[PDB]
């Protein structure tokens, strides 16, 4: 409701000069990103669970492995992204931003990556947007590497054997269009 | 979504079913259905292992915190006699009392026993009861660096939300919850 959003939204802070142009680079050539009150919302949720490692699925440009590493400046993020143009582009911002030692950039098919990402250590968190599709798969793939205790968070779940997944307590909370936090048991 | 968002409720045991019916016929304050389910879902994320609440009341949300997080412990603190008892008797009802510690006093004159606790990692207060304020400058140093004051009925607050020592969010659920986490000479002048 247009009066709750306009109190909430006035207590996001400004970003980084650099960040803020990156919000503009993504509108400009269609890459979707969070918007500024959910991108929020989980950075808080993050802060909370207290993650030392987040894996992301899609990087895009960056942004939200980004806004992750400035918000947790102890964690570090694994994040993998497909096509090398968005693949390239993220890795300058990471590199401008001197956080190429806290985000893990990988390029490029996550579906032969979890060779790799099996000898990693297990994952406090594991981020994946049900939107970039393919949602099943890599929930099957990345699920195993996540903690006991640990978190998958789904950005765009609803847009059931998720929430009925014997291993996971699932929760959907309103931000952005609905994130699923399933915690594993 | 709002709408399915709105049902998302599984059944409580019958005897936690009955304490809710109670309190809404005997109008004892109580967190909405909704709130609790966000609220207890994000406690599992963040994993506590001791709480501290303020305001028991008929021991609902002491209950159903300790019911979901089966390790943690909690020490809650009510002012009225008649809601302390009948706390102690759910809690008693529910086996519960291991877990569970009532404190039956005024915050407010109880810092100095509370002090001698060790930090908990979650303080649990709540934005329509009375105090709220005093409350929270009294009881947000045993709160751990890291650690969480939730606070209900945030929305149905400018203070805390630009308080120092906290990074403090609103969540619109239930009747809004705060989470505010807890951030990290003389002739001497002679010689020096
Ligand atoms: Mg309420
Ligand atoms: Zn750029
Ligand atoms: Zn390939
Ligand atoms: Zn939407
Ligand atoms: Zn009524
Ligand atoms: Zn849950
Ligand atoms: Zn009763
Ligand atoms: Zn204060
Ligand atoms: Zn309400």
Redesign the interface.
Known sequence: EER?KHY?EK?IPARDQYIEQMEREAHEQQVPIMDLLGM??LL??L????PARILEIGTAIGYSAIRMAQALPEATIVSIERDERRYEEAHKHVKALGLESRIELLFGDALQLGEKLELYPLFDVLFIDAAKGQYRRFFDMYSPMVRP?G?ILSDNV?FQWLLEHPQY?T????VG??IA?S?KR
């Open positions: 709750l909430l207590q929020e919302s808080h949720l802060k909370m669970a207290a205790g978190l609803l307590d929760r959907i909370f309103p269009d609905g936090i915690i």
